[PDB]
Scaffold this active site. Structure first.
Site, PDB file in Angstrom:
ATOM      1  N   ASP A  37      25.270 -50.147 -18.223  1.00  0.00           N
ATOM      2  CA  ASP A  37      24.771 -50.699 -16.970  1.00  0.00           C
ATOM      3  C   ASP A  37      25.581 -51.931 -16.584  1.00  0.00           C
ATOM      4  O   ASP A  37      25.154 -53.070 -16.765  1.00  0.00           O
ATOM      5  CB  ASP A  37      23.271 -50.949 -17.080  1.00  0.00           C
ATOM      6  CG  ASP A  37      22.501 -49.655 -17.162  1.00  0.00           C
ATOM      7  OD1 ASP A  37      23.019 -48.631 -16.654  1.00  0.00           O
ATOM      8  OD2 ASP A  37      21.365 -49.658 -17.691  1.00  0.00           O
ATOM      9  N   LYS A  59      25.748 -43.079 -20.743  1.00  0.00           N
ATOM     10  CA  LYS A  59      24.939 -42.911 -19.535  1.00  0.00           C
ATOM     11  C   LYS A  59      25.417 -43.869 -18.465  1.00  0.00           C
ATOM     12  O   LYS A  59      25.580 -45.081 -18.721  1.00  0.00           O
ATOM     13  CB  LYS A  59      23.467 -43.132 -19.856  1.00  0.00           C
ATOM     14  CG  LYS A  59      22.523 -42.836 -18.683  1.00  0.00           C
ATOM     15  CD  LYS A  59      21.063 -43.126 -19.032  1.00  0.00           C
ATOM     16  CE  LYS A  59      20.704 -44.622 -19.063  1.00  0.00           C
ATOM     17  NZ  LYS A  59      20.939 -45.274 -17.732  1.00  0.00           N
ATOM     18  N   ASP A  90      22.670 -40.991 -14.712  1.00  0.00           N
ATOM     19  CA  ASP A  90      21.234 -41.260 -14.694  1.00  0.00           C
ATOM     20  C   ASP A  90      20.743 -41.392 -13.247  1.00  0.00           C
ATOM     21  O   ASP A  90      20.132 -42.404 -12.873  1.00  0.00           O
ATOM     22  CB  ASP A  90      21.016 -42.574 -15.471  1.00  0.00           C
ATOM     23  CG  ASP A  90      19.578 -42.820 -15.893  1.00  0.00           C
ATOM     24  OD1 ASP A  90      18.808 -41.864 -16.064  1.00  0.00           O
ATOM     25  OD2 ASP A  90      19.221 -43.999 -16.102  1.00  0.00           O
ATOM     26  N   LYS A  92      18.447 -39.627 -11.596  1.00  0.00           N
ATOM     27  CA  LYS A  92      17.004 -39.557 -11.317  1.00  0.00           C
ATOM     28  C   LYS A  92      16.764 -38.978  -9.932  1.00  0.00           C
ATOM     29  O   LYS A  92      15.981 -39.450  -9.116  1.00  0.00           O
ATOM     30  CB  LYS A  92      16.315 -40.915 -11.557  1.00  0.00           C
ATOM     31  CG  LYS A  92      16.432 -41.274 -13.050  1.00  0.00           C
ATOM     32  CD  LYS A  92      15.867 -42.626 -13.481  1.00  0.00           C
ATOM     33  CE  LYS A  92      15.900 -42.720 -15.011  1.00  0.00           C
ATOM     34  NZ  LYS A  92      16.028 -44.048 -15.609  1.00  0.00           N
ATOM     35  N   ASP A  95      14.387 -35.546  -4.640  1.00  0.00           N
ATOM     36  CA  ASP A  95      14.260 -35.072  -3.266  1.00  0.00           C
ATOM     37  C   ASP A  95      14.108 -33.565  -3.319  1.00  0.00           C
ATOM     38  O   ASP A  95      14.093 -32.961  -4.395  1.00  0.00           O
ATOM     39  CB  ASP A  95      15.479 -35.537  -2.432  1.00  0.00           C
ATOM     40  CG  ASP A  95      15.165 -35.726  -0.946  1.00  0.00           C
ATOM     41  OD1 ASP A  95      14.362 -34.950  -0.359  1.00  0.00           O
ATOM     42  OD2 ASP A  95      15.726 -36.683  -0.350  1.00  0.00           O
TER      43      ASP A  95
HETATM   44  C1  LIG Z   1      15.157 -44.581 -16.484  1.00  0.00           C
HETATM   45  C2  LIG Z   1      13.953 -43.958 -16.769  1.00  0.00           C
HETATM   46  C3  LIG Z   1      13.039 -44.645 -17.584  1.00  0.00           C
HETATM   47  O1  LIG Z   1      11.929 -44.167 -17.945  1.00  0.00           O
HETATM   48  N1  LIG Z   1      13.377 -45.876 -18.066  1.00  0.00           N
HETATM   49  C4  LIG Z   1      14.568 -46.438 -17.813  1.00  0.00           C
HETATM   50  O2  LIG Z   1      14.814 -47.593 -18.245  1.00  0.00           O
HETATM   51  N2  LIG Z   1      15.455 -45.801 -17.018  1.00  0.00           N
HETATM   52  C5  LIG Z   1      16.816 -46.339 -16.979  1.00  0.00           C
HETATM   53  O3  LIG Z   1      17.240 -46.461 -18.425  1.00  0.00           O
HETATM   54  C6  LIG Z   1      17.974 -47.673 -18.652  1.00  0.00           C
HETATM   55  C7  LIG Z   1      17.221 -48.675 -19.532  1.00  0.00           C
HETATM   56  O4  LIG Z   1      18.124 -49.767 -19.739  1.00  0.00           O
HETATM   57  P1  LIG Z   1      17.664 -51.091 -20.575  1.00  0.00           P
HETATM   58  O5  LIG Z   1      17.761 -50.707 -22.037  1.00  0.00           O
HETATM   59  O6  LIG Z   1      18.690 -52.101 -20.156  1.00  0.00           O
HETATM   60  O7  LIG Z   1      16.280 -51.473 -20.166  1.00  0.00           O
HETATM   61  C8  LIG Z   1      18.296 -48.216 -17.280  1.00  0.00           C
HETATM   62  O8  LIG Z   1      19.624 -47.805 -16.875  1.00  0.00           O
HETATM   63  C9  LIG Z   1      17.219 -47.631 -16.375  1.00  0.00           C
HETATM   64  F1  LIG Z   1      17.797 -47.298 -15.182  1.00  0.00           F
HETATM   65  C1  LIG Z   2      12.113 -36.274   1.557  1.00  0.00           C
HETATM   66  C2  LIG Z   2      10.789 -36.322   1.151  1.00  0.00           C
HETATM   67  C3  LIG Z   2       9.962 -35.239   1.490  1.00  0.00           C
HETATM   68  O1  LIG Z   2       8.734 -35.184   1.211  1.00  0.00           O
HETATM   69  N1  LIG Z   2      10.488 -34.204   2.208  1.00  0.00           N
HETATM   70  C4  LIG Z   2      11.761 -34.203   2.629  1.00  0.00           C
HETATM   71  O2  LIG Z   2      12.208 -33.206   3.251  1.00  0.00           O
HETATM   72  N2  LIG Z   2      12.577 -35.227   2.300  1.00  0.00           N
HETATM   73  C5  LIG Z   2      13.868 -35.293   2.987  1.00  0.00           C
HETATM   74  O3  LIG Z   2      13.544 -35.194   4.459  1.00  0.00           O
HETATM   75  C6  LIG Z   2      14.493 -34.364   5.147  1.00  0.00           C
HETATM   76  C7  LIG Z   2      13.887 -33.053   5.655  1.00  0.00           C
HETATM   77  O4  LIG Z   2      14.927 -32.403   6.393  1.00  0.00           O
HETATM   78  P1  LIG Z   2      14.699 -30.923   7.041  1.00  0.00           P
HETATM   79  O5  LIG Z   2      13.910 -31.149   8.314  1.00  0.00           O
HETATM   80  O6  LIG Z   2      16.106 -30.467   7.288  1.00  0.00           O
HETATM   81  O7  LIG Z   2      13.980 -30.062   6.057  1.00  0.00           O
HETATM   82  C8  LIG Z   2      15.628 -34.153   4.174  1.00  0.00           C
HETATM   83  O8  LIG Z   2      16.688 -35.107   4.421  1.00  0.00           O
HETATM   84  C9  LIG Z   2      14.996 -34.349   2.801  1.00  0.00           C
HETATM   85  F1  LIG Z   2      15.889 -35.017   2.010  1.00  0.00           F
END
Ligand SMILES: *c1cc(=O)[nH]c(=O)n1[C@@H]1O[C@H](COP(=O)(O)O)[C@@H](O)[C@H]1F
Ligand SMILES: *c1cc(=O)[nH]c(=O)n1[C@@H]1O[C@H](COP(=O)(O)O)[C@@H](O)[C@H]1F
Lengths: 258, 258
Positions: A37, A59, A90, A92, A95
């Protein structure tokens, strides 16, 4: 008995990316993933080179790199091949399927071109996995599902965690395991990777909570520790990585019977 | 009575970004947010210019832009000021507070430098909001929390949705509303923005589900429709945007008593 990492690498239903990872963990005696990080490419690459022998995985958050370019990631790949570790972005993803496929394959970062592993939240339903797999299966990649989070107030508990496990089962051609705080699946094909790890008790001021490698690996049954600041903020990051490697490895051996 | 958008813009506890948005919705007779889901800067900017008068908001995924640069976003800001719409980066932050602050302020994209609004998942607990607000409050920005999702199998239901609403209440200095399928808060200070909207029934092949503007605004009580493919895939994107604008606006008027 619980199977060793080397034996798990051979399981009938093992994913090829999981098998490669498990083999190298065994070979190198490391179940440490470095959470690199940092915001500068030079520091990312200097850490990847020096700590590569100590880690099974590096990561990234490329969206925090100030000087990201694709040539930085090619260099990182060179180090990954040289030292034998996987690259895990990472990101995450969280969408709808149609969107995450675009975010995984395209844009500036082209994540799928260099990341062996990515992860995804399960909150959108299984379309998130279907979308990623459209891109990731042809590129032979794998994905982790976020079944639990390390932070205070996490909603990834109870039925939400159970849904993540089901979703992984149902997409085992692409999903190789979990981000979780503990073993969440009994099926040894699945990897468990756990962030929120430090040797000392504590947390940060923005909701992070830490547990020790012995707790995480030894008591909670996870496979790999993910460590960022516990290593990155230390003066000697190599010795810090070695401390974390030995802690997680010995916790693993002691759970196995060794 | 339910208050008009113009009266809601004056509420004692209204956030300044929400008030600016509500004013312009009222002035322009539009509660349409364009989901500008394209991969080329030229198309993004051509759509923002032509459709600017029809929209209250332009929603981006800059991580899908193949040719992102910060100069593209400066141009988009020029159009936003010219046509009077807000810029919303649909980044769906979903990590721990320490990480999302970095992802919001830094990296290549520098999201906080150009986005009036961003959104965040509530799964990590309230640290996600605390981390974003570290950056967003000094920059006078606002945030939406994802209380419900439009996709098949969404886990953002029941107690999860309730937690999102509480979290918004508790961070009302920064959180201006929700991404949701329906009104989830009774408090008129909060905006409700709803993706998953098309005039015709349907979905996509990766879990998206569509409901109509009349359903979303008129029956479910949401404020703004977010429309991507219903507009972007049409031949005439201006006429499509006008169709969606008139549908959402008239649904709003008819719910108000007008
Ligand atoms: C992602 C998911 C989660 O549950 N926890 C979490 O911390 N992350 C990511 O993992 C590392 C943790 O780094 P640290 O040891 O410095 O706290 C981060 O990159 C965070 F994004
Ligand atoms: C994000 C959250 C959610 O609940 N739904 C969702 O579709 N998104 C985002 O919103 C648009 C929907 O586009 P569409 O009308 O073409 O389906 C997307 O950008 C999606 F990322």
């Amino acid at each position: 008995k619980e199977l060793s990492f080397g034996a798990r690498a051979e399981l009938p239903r093992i994913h090829p990316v999981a098998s490669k990872l498990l083999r190298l963990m065994q070979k190198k005696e490391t179940n440490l993933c470095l959470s690199a990080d940092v915001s500068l490419a030079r520091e990312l690459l200097q850490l990847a080179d020096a700590l590569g022998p100590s880690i099974c995985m590096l990561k990234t958050h490329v969206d925090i790199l100030n000087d990201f370019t694709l040539d930085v990631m090619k260099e990182l790949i060179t180090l990954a091949k040289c030292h034998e570790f996987l690259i895990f972005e990472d990101r995450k993803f969280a969408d709808i399927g149609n969107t995450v496929k675009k975010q995984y394959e395209g844009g500036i970062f082209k994540i799928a071109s260099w990341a062996d592993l990515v992860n995804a939240h399960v909150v959108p339903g299984s379309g998130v996995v279907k979308g990623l797999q459209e891109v990731g299966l042809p590129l032979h990649r794998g994905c982790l599902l976020i079944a639990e989070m390390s932070s205070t107030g996490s909603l990834a508990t109870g039925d939400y965690t159970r849904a993540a496990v089901r979703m992984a089962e149902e997409h085992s051609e692409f999903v190789v395991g979990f981000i979780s705080g503990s073993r969440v699946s009994m099926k040894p094909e699945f990897l468990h990777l756990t962030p929120g790890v430090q040797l000392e008790a504590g947390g940060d001021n923005l909701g992070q909570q830490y547990n020790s490698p012995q707790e995480v690996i030894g008591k909670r049954g996870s496979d790999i520790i993910i460590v960022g600041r516990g290593i990155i903020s230390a003066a000697d990051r190599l010795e810090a990585a070695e401390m974390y490697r030995k802690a997680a490895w010995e916790a693993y051996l002691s759970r196995l019977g060794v």
